[PDB]
Amino acid sequence: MRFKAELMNAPEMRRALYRIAHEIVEANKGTEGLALVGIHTRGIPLAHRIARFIAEFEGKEVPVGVLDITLPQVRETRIPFDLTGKAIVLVDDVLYTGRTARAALDALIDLGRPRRIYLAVLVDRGHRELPIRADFVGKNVPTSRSEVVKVKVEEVDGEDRVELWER
Amino acid sequence: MRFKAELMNAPEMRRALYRIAHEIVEANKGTEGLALVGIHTRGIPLAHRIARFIAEFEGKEVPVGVLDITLPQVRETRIPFDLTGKAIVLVDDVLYTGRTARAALDALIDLGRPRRIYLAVLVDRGHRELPIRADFVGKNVPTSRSEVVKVKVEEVDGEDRVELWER
Ligand SMILES: [Cl-]
Ligand SMILES: [Cl-]
C-alpha cells in the first residue's frame, strides 16, 4: 500500500472552496482591497477558483497574484498589483510544516505592507514546525509522519482529487 | 475611563505559567535541545520564570535567550547558544496583531535553523493581522479594537497583574 485512501473528491473540493470563498469575504467584510496570491504550484489554480466563486456571489472580481514558491525555489512570480494596504490571502493546496507558507509570507512582506495577510489552504495535514496556522481550511487531515498528501486539480493533473499516501 | 478590569492576578499568572511550562516540555517530549527566547520586554522575565518552573519539575535547566524587539526596534539581543537544530520557544507577554511575533520569528531564522519554533504567550488578545498563532497561551482575552491589554510583572513593574484598559 503506497496509495492509502481518498481524502477528497471533486464535489467535496468544490464545496470546500466555496466555503473558503465565503469565509474570506466575511472576514474582509467585503471585497475592498482584497486580493489572492497562489503559491506552491496547485495553490495558483485554487486561488483562481476561489476568485471565480467570489465574483459569482459578490459581483466584483478579485485580483489573483502568483508566487510559485517551493522548498527555496520559485518558477514564476506575478503580482500585477500593489500589496500595500491590501487584504492579501495566500492560497496553498496543503499546509504541512508551515515552512513553505512562512517563506511565502516572507516574500510578500519584502514586496509591500498588506493591511492584513490571511492563509487559506485546501488541506491542513498538521505537523507544524513553525507558529503558522491557516485562517481558512478546506479539510483537516490528521496524518502520520510517514504519510503524504497528494492534491490533484484539473488545471494541472486533469482531475480534482485529494489522496492520502504512505511509505 | 482608561482602566476597565483586572484580567489576571498574581496567582492566576503563576498557575498559567506553570501550565505553559508543562505544555512546553510535553510538546518537546523532554528538555532535549530546548531553549526559550524572551521578546517584547516583559517576555524576558516570563521566559526566566518558565525556565525556573521547568527545572523545578524536570531537573535540568533550560537556556533563556533575549531578543528584546518591539515595533522595528531592539534594546538588547543575547542568545548564548546555537539556535540550529534546537527546539526554540519564543516567549511573549501579549499576542496581538502577530506582527511583533513575526518580526521575532524573522530574526531567529536569520540567526539559525531551529528544529522547531514554538510561540508561548501569557495572553492572546486576538485581532491577528498575520497567520501567526500561539502554541501555548496563558489566557485568551476577547477584546475590542479600542481596548488595550497591560501586563505588569514584578521584575519590571513591581507587581504581577494583567489589566484591561480602553479608550
Ligand atoms: Cl508549509
Ligand atoms: Cl503580536
UniProtKB/Swiss-Prot annotation, chains A, B:
Catalysed reactions listed for this entry: UMP + diphosphate = 5-phospho-alpha-D-ribose 1-diphosphate + uracil
Key word Protein transport present: no
GO molecular function, a single term: RNA binding
Superkingdom of the source species: Bacteria
Keywords on record: Glycosyltransferase, Repressor, RNA-binding, Transcription, Transcription regulation, Transcription termination, Transferase
Role noted for this protein: Probably regulates transcriptional attenuation of the pyrimidine nucleotide (pyr) operon in response to exogenous pyrimidines. In contrast to pyr attenuation in Bacillus, PyrR from Thermus could act as a translational repressor: the binding of PyrR at its proposed recognition site in the transcript would prevent initiation of translation of the leader peptide, resulting in terminator formation and reduced expression of downstream genes. Also displays uracil phosphoribosyltransferase activity.
Pfam families cross-referenced by the UniProt entry: Pribosyltran (PF00156)
Residues engaged in binding substrate: T41, R42, R75, D92, D93, V94, L95, Y96, T97, G98, R99, T100, R125, V149
Signal peptide: none
Motif PRPP-binding, chain ranges: 88-100
Organism (species): Thermus thermophilus (strain ATCC 27634 / DSM 579 / HB8)
Name by which UniProt lists this protein: Bifunctional protein PyrR
